[model samples]
Target: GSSGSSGLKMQVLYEFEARNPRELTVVQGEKLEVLDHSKRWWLVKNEAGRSGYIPSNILEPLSGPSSG
Candidate 1:
């Protein structure tokens, strides 16, 4: 039901433990698809197609190496 680009790729910077299924726990070095962002959280989906909300502070946009 949503329309947009696939989503921005993001890298998890820290380990997160979710207390419920609605939340997502990400491990360092894992990649996630960022569907939406807010002041403190982002709607993300893992490669497995699991979607949930994660804290914004835990993720960083994945950037490719600069072309030299």
Candidate 2:
């Protein structure tokens, strides 16, 4: 699925702990799609189509989003 990228796409930060602040829930060992991205935020959809926001700096393309 598109949700699973070739590698990591973004990182979840503490600032993105809000509800729907971002637009994605990246699972462990899974890929994250950047449906939409910006300088301060990104709108990505999870494998289940769930979306959320996180700090841009917190997002590390080399690695996928963080877990709870």
Candidate 3:
């Protein structure tokens, strides 16, 4: 159970080939802009503006260091 605000940068750690119409297929080392999430899935949008569910475990959060 994890959550993050808009555009929390993330990197893909595994490949996910979508099986649902609303799901997204992403390969390893891809960029995911965290949109919204709950439990084990996060609805993220790729650079192309496509939003869908990808298991949170397949992604590694890329929190930035710009706190200022």
Candidate 1 per-residue lDDT, tens place, 1-68, comes to 35665647788898888888789778998888887886477888876778888888888868889675
Provide the TM-score for each candidate, comma-separated: 0.77, 0.46, 0.75
| lDDT minimum window of 10 residues, candidate 2 | 21-30
Of 1 and 2, the candidate ahead on TM-score is: 1
Ranking by TM-score: 1, 3, 2
Give the 10-residue window scoring lowest on summed lDDT in candidate 3: 1-10
Candidate 3 per-residue lDDT, tens place, 1-68, comes to 23644446688899989999989999998877777766578888876778889989888866679685
Better of 2 and 3 by TM-score: 3
Q: Under the 3 Å rule for N, CA and C atoms, how many clashes does model 1 have?
A: 0
On residues 1-68, what C-alpha lDDT tens digit does candidate 2 reach at each position? 53345543554443334555444444343445565664566666565667676445555554437673
- lDDT, each prediction: 0.81, 0.52, 0.81
What does the lDDT read for residue 10 in candidate 1?
Answer: 86
TM-score of 3: 0.75
